[PDB]
Design an enzyme around this catalytic site. Structure first.
Site, PDB file in Angstrom:
ATOM      1  N   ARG A   1       0.794  -1.199   0.000  1.00  9.79           N
ATOM      2  CA  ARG A   1       0.000   0.000   0.000  1.00  9.79           C
ATOM      3  C   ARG A   1       0.828   1.250   0.000  1.00  9.79           C
ATOM      4  O   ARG A   1       1.630   1.538   0.940  1.00  9.79           O
ATOM      5  CB  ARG A   1      -0.964  -0.037   1.214  1.00  9.79           C
ATOM      6  CG  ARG A   1      -1.775   1.148   1.571  1.00  9.79           C
ATOM      7  CD  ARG A   1      -2.670   0.928   2.767  1.00  9.79           C
ATOM      8  NE  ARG A   1      -3.576   2.040   3.017  1.00  9.79           N
ATOM      9  CZ  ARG A   1      -3.613   2.834   4.061  1.00  9.79           C
ATOM     10  NH1 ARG A   1      -2.683   2.817   5.046  1.00  9.79           N
ATOM     11  NH2 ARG A   1      -4.544   3.772   4.040  1.00  9.79           N
TER      12      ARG A   1
ATOM     13  N   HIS B   1       0.232   6.032  16.078  1.00  7.17           N
ATOM     14  CA  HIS B   1       1.127   5.018  15.510  1.00  7.17           C
ATOM     15  C   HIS B   1       2.465   5.233  16.234  1.00  7.17           C
ATOM     16  O   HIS B   1       2.891   6.353  16.327  1.00  7.17           O
ATOM     17  CB  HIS B   1       1.266   5.215  13.997  1.00  7.17           C
ATOM     18  CG  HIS B   1      -0.017   4.997  13.265  1.00  7.17           C
ATOM     19  ND1 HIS B   1      -0.477   3.739  12.929  1.00  7.17           N
ATOM     20  CD2 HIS B   1      -1.033   5.844  12.981  1.00  7.17           C
ATOM     21  CE1 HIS B   1      -1.706   3.827  12.446  1.00  7.17           C
ATOM     22  NE2 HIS B   1      -2.056   5.105  12.431  1.00  7.17           N
TER      23      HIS B   1
ATOM     24  N   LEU C   1      -0.858  11.718  12.883  1.00  4.24           N
ATOM     25  CA  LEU C   1      -0.618  10.366  13.361  1.00  4.24           C
ATOM     26  C   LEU C   1      -0.009  10.255  14.755  1.00  4.24           C
ATOM     27  O   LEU C   1       0.126   9.172  15.251  1.00  4.24           O
ATOM     28  CB  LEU C   1       0.278   9.643  12.345  1.00  4.24           C
ATOM     29  CG  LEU C   1      -0.277   9.479  10.927  1.00  4.24           C
ATOM     30  CD1 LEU C   1       0.567   8.689   9.883  1.00  4.24           C
ATOM     31  CD2 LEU C   1      -1.730   9.065  10.964  1.00  4.24           C
TER      32      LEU C   1
ATOM     33  N   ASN D   1      -1.138  -0.100  12.299  1.00 12.64           N
ATOM     34  CA  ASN D   1      -1.943  -0.853  13.222  1.00 12.64           C
ATOM     35  C   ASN D   1      -3.409  -0.772  12.831  1.00 12.64           C
ATOM     36  O   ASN D   1      -3.765  -0.082  11.864  1.00 12.64           O
ATOM     37  CB  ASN D   1      -1.724  -0.432  14.714  1.00 12.64           C
ATOM     38  CG  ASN D   1      -2.229   0.956  15.002  1.00 12.64           C
ATOM     39  OD1 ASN D   1      -3.322   1.370  14.579  1.00 12.64           O
ATOM     40  ND2 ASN D   1      -1.270   1.784  15.441  1.00 12.64           N
TER      41      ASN D   1
ATOM     42  N   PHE E   1       5.124   1.540   8.139  1.00 11.99           N
ATOM     43  CA  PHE E   1       5.088   2.510   7.090  1.00 11.99           C
ATOM     44  C   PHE E   1       6.256   3.425   7.182  1.00 11.99           C
ATOM     45  O   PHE E   1       6.798   3.753   8.243  1.00 11.99           O
ATOM     46  CB  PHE E   1       3.754   3.223   6.935  1.00 11.99           C
ATOM     47  CG  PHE E   1       3.356   4.038   8.121  1.00 11.99           C
ATOM     48  CD1 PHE E   1       2.649   3.480   9.192  1.00 11.99           C
ATOM     49  CD2 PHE E   1       3.581   5.419   8.097  1.00 11.99           C
ATOM     50  CE1 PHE E   1       2.353   4.266  10.266  1.00 11.99           C
ATOM     51  CE2 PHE E   1       3.155   6.224   9.166  1.00 11.99           C
ATOM     52  CZ  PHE E   1       2.589   5.623  10.251  1.00 11.99           C
TER      53      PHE E   1
END
EC number: 5.2.1.8
Lengths: 135, 165
Positions: free
Chosen positions: B55, B126, B122, B102, B113
């Site tokens: 991704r 994360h 974020l 997650n 990532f």
């Protein structure tokens, strides 16, 4: 966007006062909740004073449906792509852990996640539970 | 050194693209750094070698580490169970930050990532655990194979990986 009206609410209170928990509450509840957000649905339910045991039967069904939802819709790995929203959880669909533009987004996206219609289906199942108990 | 360094040799449909190396902040997030280090060496008998960046969202991040299902639904940590968010001390301050993917609080496995922009929103969601040392330009190149919804246009693979020193 406009939150549910006092006049709509007055009519729903009138329905609930007279008609028991007769079968007829179900079609009234559906007409009066057309296009509701989850907040609207909770606002209609909140208006119901008393009928505490019945209200608890409804909550139990909502709780059961929310957990089923969660089981059938696992959360994608994040981080969420920018310009997007978390997929809703059961709690978000029932309005307890979500806010209103949080609810409206879902209902507008392409395609939509119609959180109001889904929560409405749950409510309806809980009203059927109530009607079979009392009538 | 206290902080290990790990390397990925990236390939694009079998062809070599280039090496990216990372500093892992063991001195702030030792459990999360050790996980990624051990998965990078293969020392537990499984890990990142051969896995893909499933991704990639241009202007946001490149995500990988799902070496069990290759599509974002799998991955596993070295701990025999998902593990807790160690801390949120370190922030997502710009390109190159290395952070844990997650599916909610305290669900870290193997997915990670690499930020290609500042992603401050974020912070507290994360766990940041390293940073790109060499090869940012390779990460930037990887970004060109992504899309708005993250689907990649070629197979972006960790053809080899390990610990440097």
């Amino acid at each position: 966007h406009q939150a549910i009206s006092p006049r709509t609410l007055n009519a729903w209170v009138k329905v609930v006062e007279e008609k028991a928990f007769s079968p007829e509450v179900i079609p009234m509840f559906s007409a009066l909740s057309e296009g509701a957000t989850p907040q609207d649905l909770n606002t209609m339910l909140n208006t119901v004073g008393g009928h505490q045991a019945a209200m608890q039967m409804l909550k139990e069904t909502i709780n059961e449906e929310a957990a089923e939802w969660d089981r059938l819709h696992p959360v994608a790995m994040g981080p969420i792509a920018p310009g997007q929203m978390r997929e809703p959880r059961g709690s978000d669909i029932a309005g307890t852990t979500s806010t209103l533009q949080e609810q409206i987004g879902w209902m507008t996206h392409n395609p939509p996640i119609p959180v109001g219609e889904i929560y409405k289906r749950w409510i309806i199942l809980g009203l059927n539970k109530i009607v079979r108990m009392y009538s | 050194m206290v902080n290990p360094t790990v390397f990925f040799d990236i390939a694009v449909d079998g062809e070599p693209l280039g090496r990216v190396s990372f500093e892992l902040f063991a001195d702030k997030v030792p459990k999360t750094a050790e996980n990624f280090r051990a998965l990078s060496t293969g020392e537990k008998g499984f890990g990142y070698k051969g896995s893909c960046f499933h991704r990639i969202i241009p202007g946001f991040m490149c995500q990988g580490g799902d070496f069990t299902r290759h599509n974002g639904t799998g991955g596993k940590s070295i701990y025999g169970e998902k593990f807790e968010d160690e801390n949120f001390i370190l922030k997502h301050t710009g390109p190159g930050i290395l952070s844990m993917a997650n599916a909610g609080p305290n669900t870290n496995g193997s997915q990670f990532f690499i930020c290609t922009a500042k992603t401050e929103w974020l912070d507290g969601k994360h766990v940041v655990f390293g940073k790109v040392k060499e090869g940012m330009n390779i990460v930037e190149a990887m970004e060109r194979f992504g899309s708005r919804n993250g689907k990649t246009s070629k197979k972006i693979t960790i053809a080899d990986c390990g610990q440097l020193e």
